[PDB]
Design a protein around this ligand. Structure first.
Ligand SMILES: Nc1ncnc2c1ncn2[C@@H]1O[C@H](COP(=O)(O)OP(=O)(O)NP(=O)(O)O)[C@@H](O)[C@H]1O
Ligand SMILES: [Ca+2]
Ligand SMILES: [Ca+2]
Ligand SMILES: [Ca+2]
Ligand SMILES: [Ca+2]
Ligand SMILES: [Cl-]
Ligand SMILES: [Mg+2]
Length: 476
């Protein structure tokens, strides 16, 4: 049953690994905490109901004022390649692993409070996050999960009137991030490149036993684990590409060891399709552009593989990395076939998908709404309506014919079954930047109605909701 805040059970596994992997650090509170928004689904991971998130004590805990005695807040140490260049020392500069909760299902869940204050790893930073940062990370975490895209989760956002300077005067907020691990590729890189072989093995054994235990029985457990990580990453990137999620900062310290989306900063969901969109205004070379996310993910896996060379041969590691691209293409094509309402794999499907994207590229076509409208009517009628959005309208007619011929080349069910199949994987509502911005503006004025409704709508992004037509609109 849903329990009280005082009934949470803690089992702080990572804290017990010692001071070589993290440092005990308490949060620095922020003033006048208020609950901005909370996720019922995320809270359920901790056996908590939404009503427990409305308690003053709840806002106090996740703004740094109070903390269970059974917790042990810790700042992790890690490193990472940042935009291709190795940085020998990063770590939790503005967040803390408060502890790990053991829920009734028998699962361990990290409680990471992001924006909790300065730590030994903050360097010159203030250890804070501003309200717009916390709200965007909360919305994207839970929107991705509702979409079926593996992601770190977010339980709540808590506001404050603690001043924080960025470009202008802003105010500190914290987001409670939940995940079953906060270990990153960069966690292993740090121990590898500082040549701490005992601790590197202890961390790899922690990841192995807690998250890939089936691999322990195999002749080379760390090779099997690496293969599983490569698989999870291929599935993750396939979902990003299929649904137009741009991360923006795919540094190796932001690659989760579990294959979940991690660290939401300058992300963006594509509005108009653009295979080369650069969502990060600081990514001057386009290293983390939409299309580059595929080769970058492979590069990051090679960087992870380096940290495992003490245990696995270079040849075996590089052979495993070679599985990434075919696995990505398999899952990507599967996802895009489903977005097109197709239910079997046929030889030229990759060309069909590729041709659709090239037609979208310079025609100003909304990625999400194209696939939703494609399924909302029989293909012939939907395509006649979508015709006008394309510049090369006669090339599109040829693609539309190829698509209708592809439908006819398989048993595709009734028109109604097709509609339900496609609307079950094609969202009507997505976390568009302009929608998040409107929620942020209202919240910065003290009005949290908008951010809450937007979050609510995205909990069921595939289901039409009455009166929410504004959330299905293209950007104005
Ligand atoms: N305001 C800040 N104060 C202190 N450290 C910071 C601050 N902003 C970023 N950092 C650190 O700078 C590095 C790069 O930040 P980034 O990759 O954006 O991660 P993050 O969003 O700060 N936290 P996380 O989501 O857990 O990766 C990390 O080691 C951060 O902890
Ligand atoms: Ca970040
Ligand atoms: Ca085009
Ligand atoms: Ca257009
Ligand atoms: Ca039929
Ligand atoms: Cl920030
Ligand atoms: Mg980061």
């Amino acid at each position: 049953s849903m329990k009280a805040l005082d009934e949470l059970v803690f089992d702080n596994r990572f804290a017990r690994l010692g001071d070589a992997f993290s440092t005990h650090v308490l949060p620095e509170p922020i003033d006048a905490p208020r609950l901005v928004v909370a996720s019922e689904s995320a809270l359920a991971l901790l056996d908590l109901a939404p009503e427990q998130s409305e308690l003053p004590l709840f806002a106090e805990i996740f703004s740094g004022h109070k903390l269970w005695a059974e917790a042990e807040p810790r700042a992790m140490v890690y490193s990472g390649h940042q935009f291709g260049s190795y940085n020998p020392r990063l770590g939790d500069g503005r967040g803390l692993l408060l502890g790990e909760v053991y829920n009734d299902a028998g699962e361990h869940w990290d409680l990471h409070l992001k924006g909790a204050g300065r730590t030994p790893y903050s360097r010159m930073g203030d250890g804070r996050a501003v309200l717009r940062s916390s709200i965007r990370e909360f919305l994207a975490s839970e929107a991705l999960h509702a979409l079926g895209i593996p992601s770190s989760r977010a339980a709540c956002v808590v506001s404050s009137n603690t001043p924080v300077w960025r470009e202008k005067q802003e105010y500190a907020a914290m987001v409670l991030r939940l995940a079953q691990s906060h270990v990153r590729f960069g966690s292993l890189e740090y121990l590898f490149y500082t040549k701490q072989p005992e601790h590197l093995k202890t961390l790899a054994e922690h990841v192995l036993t807690m998250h890939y235990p089936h691999c322990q029985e195999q002749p080379e457990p760390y090779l099997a684990m690496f293969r599983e990580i490569v698989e999870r990453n291929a599935e993750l990137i396939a979902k990003w590409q299929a649904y137009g999620f741009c991360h923006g900062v795919m540094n190796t310290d932001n690659m989760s060891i579990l294959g979940i989306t991690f660290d939401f900063g300058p992300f963006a969901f594509l509005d108009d399709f653009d295979e080369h969109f650069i969502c990060n205004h600081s990514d001057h070379e386009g290293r983390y552009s939409f299309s580059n996310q595929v080769p970058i993910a492979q590069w990051n896996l090679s960087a992870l593989g380096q940290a495992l060379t003490p245990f696995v041969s270079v040849e075996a590691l590089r052979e495993t990395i070679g599985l990434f691209l075919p696995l990505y293409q398999a899952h990507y094509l599967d996802l895009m076939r489903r977005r097109l309402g197709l239910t079997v794999a046929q030889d030229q499907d990759d060309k069909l998908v590729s041709q659709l994207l090239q037609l979208m590229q310079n025609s100003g076509v909304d990625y999400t709404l194209f696939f939703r409208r494609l399924g909302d009517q029989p293909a012939a009628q939907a395509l006649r309506a979508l015709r006008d959005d394309f510049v090369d309208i006669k090339v599109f007619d040829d693609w539309a014919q190829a698509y209708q011929a592809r439908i006819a080349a398989e048993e595709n069910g009734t028109e109604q079954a097709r509609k339900e199949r496609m609307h079950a994987v094609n969202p009507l509502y997505i976390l568009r930047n302009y929608l998040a911005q409107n929620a942020i503006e209202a919240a910065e004025k003290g009005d949290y109605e908008e951010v809450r409704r937007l979050h609510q709508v995205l909990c069921t992004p595939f289901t039409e909701q009455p009166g929410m037509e504004g959330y299905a609109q293209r950007p104005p």
